[PDB]
Amino acid sequence: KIFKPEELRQALMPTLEALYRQDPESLPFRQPVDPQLLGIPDYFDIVKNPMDLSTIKRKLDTGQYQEPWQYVDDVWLMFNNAWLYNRKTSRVYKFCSKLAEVFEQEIDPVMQSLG
């Protein structure tokens, strides 16, 4: 099980695409949280390892995932950051849960075909 970077990218991209295509639910995740702009200075005290869809795309595009599970970990990291920081009935949390639902449905067959 060694992965050619461009094949790993071609296999995983559709799952990322499916997250981006969710409108409105992807919109808070399409770019990084900037706590200084938002005036939420407690954010990096709770979210130690920020992640968002733009960063995941960059990493997927520049060979930073050697194995499929590192991509999965980063998608879950984005979700878990939102779920820990935000109120359960908040738009961000509700939106996050939708992306998670989409990801769960998308990722499973893909991971089985990879290994």
Residue numbers in the entry: 1083 to 1197
How does the study describe this entry?
Bromodomains (BRDs) are protein interaction modules that specifically recognize ε-N-lysine acetylation motifs, a key event in the reading process of epigenetic marks. The 61 BRDs in the human genome cluster into eight families based on structure/sequence similarity. Despite large sequence variations, all BRD modules share a conserved fold that comprises a left-handed bundle of four α helices (αZ, αA, αB, αC), linked by loop regions of variable length (ZA and BC loops), which line the Kac binding site and determine binding specificity. The four helices form a deep cavity that is extended by the two loop regions (ZA and BC loops), creating a largely hydrophobic Kac binding pocket.
Indeed, ITC experiments showed that the binding affinity of many BRDs was significantly increased for multiply modified peptides. For example, the KD of CREBBP decreased from 733 μM for H3K14ac to 131 μM for H3pS10K14acK18ac suggesting that many BRDs recognize a pattern of modifications rather than a single Kac mark. As a consequence, BRD acetyl-lysine binding sites are deep and largely hydrophobic binding pockets that represent attractive targeting sites for the development of Kac competitive inhibitors.
